[PDB]
Design a protein around this nucleic acid. Structure first.
Length: 148
RNA sequence: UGAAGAGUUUGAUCAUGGCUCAGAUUGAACGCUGGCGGCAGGCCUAACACAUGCAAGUCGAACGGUCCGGAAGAAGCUUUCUU
Protein backbone atom coordinates (compact mmCIF):
# COMPACT_ATOMS: atom_id res chain seq x y z
CA UNK A 1 0.00 0.00 0.00
CA UNK A 2 1.09 3.57 0.73
CA UNK A 3 4.76 3.99 1.66
CA UNK A 4 6.06 6.76 3.93
CA UNK A 5 9.39 8.58 3.69
CA UNK A 6 10.88 10.84 6.36
CA UNK A 7 12.15 13.93 4.55
CA UNK A 8 13.54 15.74 7.58
CA UNK A 9 12.91 16.58 11.24
CA UNK A 10 13.81 19.77 13.10
CA UNK A 11 14.27 20.38 16.83
CA UNK A 12 12.62 23.81 16.69
CA UNK A 13 12.82 25.84 19.90
CA UNK A 14 11.14 29.04 21.06
CA UNK A 15 11.37 31.42 24.01
CA UNK A 16 8.21 31.78 26.10
CA UNK A 17 7.26 33.39 29.42
CA UNK A 18 8.53 30.64 31.69
CA UNK A 19 11.37 29.10 29.72
CA UNK A 20 11.98 27.10 26.55
CA UNK A 21 9.25 24.92 25.05
CA UNK A 22 10.50 22.44 22.45
CA UNK A 23 8.33 21.29 19.55
CA UNK A 24 9.53 18.92 16.82
CA UNK A 25 8.58 19.35 13.16
CA UNK A 26 8.63 16.58 10.56
CA UNK A 27 8.28 16.36 6.78
CA UNK A 28 6.69 13.13 5.54
CA UNK A 29 5.96 11.94 2.01
CA UNK A 30 3.24 9.36 1.43
CA UNK A 31 2.86 7.64 -1.92
CA UNK A 32 1.79 4.36 -3.51
CA UNK A 33 4.10 4.62 -6.51
CA UNK A 34 1.50 4.59 -9.27
CA UNK A 35 0.64 8.28 -9.45
CA UNK A 36 -0.36 9.42 -5.97
CA UNK A 37 1.74 11.68 -3.74
CA UNK A 38 1.15 13.19 -0.31
CA UNK A 39 3.08 15.79 1.66
CA UNK A 40 2.65 16.15 5.41
CA UNK A 41 4.24 18.50 7.93
CA UNK A 42 2.93 18.36 11.48
CA UNK A 43 4.45 19.33 14.82
CA UNK A 44 4.28 17.67 18.24
CA UNK A 45 5.90 17.68 21.68
CA UNK A 46 7.34 14.28 20.79
CA UNK A 47 9.23 13.27 17.64
CA UNK A 48 7.17 10.14 16.85
CA UNK A 49 3.97 12.05 17.64
CA UNK A 50 4.95 14.60 14.99
CA UNK A 51 5.98 11.94 12.47
CA UNK A 52 2.64 10.14 12.77
CA UNK A 53 0.67 13.39 12.82
CA UNK A 54 2.60 14.33 9.69
CA UNK A 55 1.77 11.10 7.85
CA UNK A 56 -1.91 11.67 8.61
CA UNK A 57 -1.73 15.18 7.16
CA UNK A 58 0.23 13.93 4.15
CA UNK A 59 -2.47 11.39 3.31
CA UNK A 60 -5.12 14.10 3.67
CA UNK A 61 -3.57 16.25 0.94
CA UNK A 62 -2.66 14.09 -2.06
CA UNK A 63 -2.00 14.90 -5.71
CA UNK A 64 -2.54 12.72 -8.79
CA UNK A 65 0.65 13.11 -10.82
CA UNK A 66 0.01 12.16 -14.45
CA UNK A 67 2.97 9.83 -14.92
CA UNK A 68 3.97 8.72 -18.42
CA UNK A 69 6.39 5.82 -18.87
CA UNK A 70 8.06 6.54 -15.54
CA UNK A 71 8.40 10.22 -16.44
CA UNK A 72 6.38 13.44 -16.58
CA UNK A 73 4.43 15.07 -19.41
CA UNK A 74 6.49 18.27 -19.54
CA UNK A 75 9.11 20.47 -17.80
CA UNK A 76 7.86 22.78 -15.05
CA UNK A 77 9.34 25.53 -12.87
CA UNK A 78 7.47 26.14 -9.63
CA UNK A 79 8.59 29.02 -7.43
CA UNK A 80 7.50 28.85 -3.79
CA UNK A 81 8.56 31.84 -1.68
CA UNK A 82 12.32 32.25 -2.08
CA UNK A 83 12.69 28.65 -3.23
CA UNK A 84 12.53 27.51 -6.86
CA UNK A 85 12.21 24.03 -8.37
CA UNK A 86 12.59 22.85 -11.96
CA UNK A 87 11.63 19.50 -13.49
CA UNK A 88 12.45 17.99 -16.88
CA UNK A 89 11.30 14.64 -18.35
CA UNK A 90 14.03 12.21 -19.39
CA UNK A 91 14.40 8.89 -21.21
CA UNK A 92 14.56 5.63 -19.26
CA UNK A 93 17.87 4.72 -17.65
CA UNK A 94 18.56 8.23 -16.37
CA UNK A 95 17.23 7.61 -12.88
CA UNK A 96 15.72 10.11 -10.45
CA UNK A 97 18.36 12.85 -10.41
CA UNK A 98 17.37 15.40 -7.77
CA UNK A 99 17.84 16.47 -4.17
CA UNK A 100 16.65 14.29 -1.31
CA UNK A 101 13.66 16.59 -0.84
CA UNK A 102 12.36 16.38 -4.41
CA UNK A 103 13.49 12.81 -5.13
CA UNK A 104 11.70 11.30 -2.13
CA UNK A 105 8.53 13.03 -3.35
CA UNK A 106 9.16 11.83 -6.90
CA UNK A 107 10.03 8.24 -6.00
CA UNK A 108 6.75 7.72 -4.15
CA UNK A 109 5.11 9.65 -6.98
CA UNK A 110 6.00 6.71 -9.18
CA UNK A 111 8.47 8.75 -11.21
CA UNK A 112 11.22 6.46 -12.51
CA UNK A 113 13.21 9.04 -14.49
CA UNK A 114 13.48 12.84 -14.32
CA UNK A 115 16.00 15.69 -14.38
CA UNK A 116 15.60 18.37 -11.71
CA UNK A 117 17.45 21.09 -9.80
CA UNK A 118 16.86 23.46 -6.88
CA UNK A 119 17.08 27.22 -7.39
CA UNK A 120 17.17 30.14 -4.96
CA UNK A 121 16.36 29.24 -1.36
CA UNK A 122 17.37 25.69 -0.41
CA UNK A 123 14.88 25.52 2.46
CA UNK A 124 13.64 21.88 2.59
CA UNK A 125 10.17 22.99 3.66
CA UNK A 126 9.83 25.47 0.80
CA UNK A 127 11.29 23.16 -1.84
CA UNK A 128 8.88 20.32 -1.05
CA UNK A 129 6.00 22.80 -1.35
CA UNK A 130 7.39 23.95 -4.69
CA UNK A 131 7.80 20.35 -5.86
CA UNK A 132 4.20 19.41 -5.06
CA UNK A 133 2.90 22.61 -6.66
CA UNK A 134 4.79 21.74 -9.82
CA UNK A 135 3.35 18.23 -9.76
CA UNK A 136 -0.09 19.85 -9.76
CA UNK A 137 0.40 22.16 -12.75
CA UNK A 138 1.37 19.04 -14.71
CA UNK A 139 -0.98 18.51 -17.65
CA UNK A 140 -1.28 15.91 -20.41
CA UNK A 141 -2.21 16.34 -24.10
CA UNK A 142 -5.55 14.73 -23.23
CA UNK A 143 -6.29 17.29 -20.53
CA UNK A 144 -5.16 20.22 -22.68
CA UNK A 145 -7.22 19.00 -25.63
CA UNK A 146 -10.32 18.35 -23.52
CA UNK A 147 -9.54 21.65 -21.79
CA UNK A 148 -9.53 23.58 -25.07
C1' U B 1 22.89 11.65 -20.90
C1' G B 2 24.32 16.66 -18.26
C1' A B 3 24.36 20.71 -12.46
C1' A B 4 22.78 16.93 -4.41
C1' G B 5 25.64 20.71 -0.69
C1' A B 6 27.32 21.44 4.38
C1' G B 7 29.51 24.41 8.97
C1' U B 8 29.75 29.58 11.22
C1' U B 9 27.83 36.49 12.44
C1' U B 10 20.84 35.39 16.75
C1' G B 11 18.16 34.31 22.75
C1' A B 12 15.30 32.42 18.39
C1' U B 13 13.85 33.73 12.85
C1' C B 14 14.51 35.34 7.77
C1' A B 15 17.66 37.84 4.39
C1' U B 16 22.34 39.81 2.82
C1' G B 17 27.44 38.46 3.09
C1' G B 18 32.60 36.77 3.94
C1' C B 19 35.33 32.75 5.53
C1' U B 20 35.77 27.23 5.66
C1' C B 21 35.20 21.68 4.47
C1' A B 22 35.18 15.87 2.24
C1' G B 23 37.57 14.96 -4.02
C1' A B 24 41.43 14.84 -7.91
C1' U B 25 46.43 16.32 -9.33
C1' U B 26 52.01 17.50 -8.52
C1' G B 27 59.60 16.12 -13.09
C1' A B 28 58.11 17.43 -5.26
C1' A B 29 60.24 17.78 -0.37
C1' C B 30 60.01 16.22 4.98
C1' G B 31 58.70 12.33 9.13
C1' C B 32 58.13 6.97 10.54
C1' U B 33 58.73 2.48 7.79
C1' G B 34 60.47 -0.37 3.79
C1' G B 35 60.83 -7.10 0.20
C1' C B 36 60.86 -8.13 -5.35
C1' G B 37 59.95 -6.91 -10.48
C1' G B 38 58.37 -4.16 -15.12
C1' C B 39 57.63 0.68 -17.40
C1' A B 40 58.27 5.78 -16.63
C1' G B 41 60.61 9.71 -14.40
C1' G B 42 64.78 12.97 -11.78
C1' C B 43 68.68 20.86 -9.60
C1' C B 44 61.29 23.58 -10.24
C1' U B 45 66.59 26.80 -6.43
C1' A B 46 73.06 31.43 -9.25
C1' A B 47 74.48 33.25 -16.68
C1' C B 48 78.48 31.79 -9.21
C1' A B 49 83.56 29.85 -9.67
C1' C B 50 85.68 25.35 -11.92
C1' A B 51 90.44 20.29 -11.23
C1' U B 52 90.42 16.14 -15.08
C1' G B 53 88.90 13.37 -19.71
C1' C B 54 85.89 13.63 -23.91
C1' A B 55 82.43 16.78 -27.96
C1' A B 56 84.62 15.57 -37.05
C1' G B 57 86.84 13.84 -40.41
C1' U B 58 87.68 11.55 -44.70
C1' C B 59 90.38 10.53 -49.65
C1' G B 60 97.19 7.20 -52.58
C1' A B 61 91.67 5.71 -58.85
C1' A B 62 95.17 14.17 -56.80
C1' C B 63 101.29 14.11 -55.64
C1' G B 64 106.75 13.72 -53.25
C1' G B 65 109.06 11.78 -47.69
C1' U B 66 108.97 9.24 -42.34
C1' C B 67 106.47 5.30 -38.89
C1' C B 68 104.28 0.01 -38.89
C1' G B 69 104.02 -4.78 -42.08
C1' G B 70 104.78 -8.50 -46.01
C1' A B 71 107.42 -10.45 -50.38
C1' A B 72 111.54 -10.99 -53.91
C1' G B 73 117.07 -9.92 -54.88
C1' A B 74 123.29 -8.92 -54.61
C1' A B 75 125.95 -12.98 -50.35
C1' G B 76 128.87 -19.44 -48.61
C1' C B 77 126.96 -16.86 -43.71
C1' U B 78 126.99 -11.88 -41.37
C1' U B 79 127.03 -6.75 -41.93
C1' U B 80 125.19 -3.65 -45.35
C1' C B 81 122.22 -2.76 -49.21
C1' U B 82 118.52 -2.96 -53.83
C1' U B 83 113.49 -3.62 -55.99
Amino acid sequence: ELQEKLIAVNRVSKTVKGGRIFSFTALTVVGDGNGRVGFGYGKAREVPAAIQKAMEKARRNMINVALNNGTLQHPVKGVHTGSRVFMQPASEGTGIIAGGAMRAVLEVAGVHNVLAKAYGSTNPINVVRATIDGLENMNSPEMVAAKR
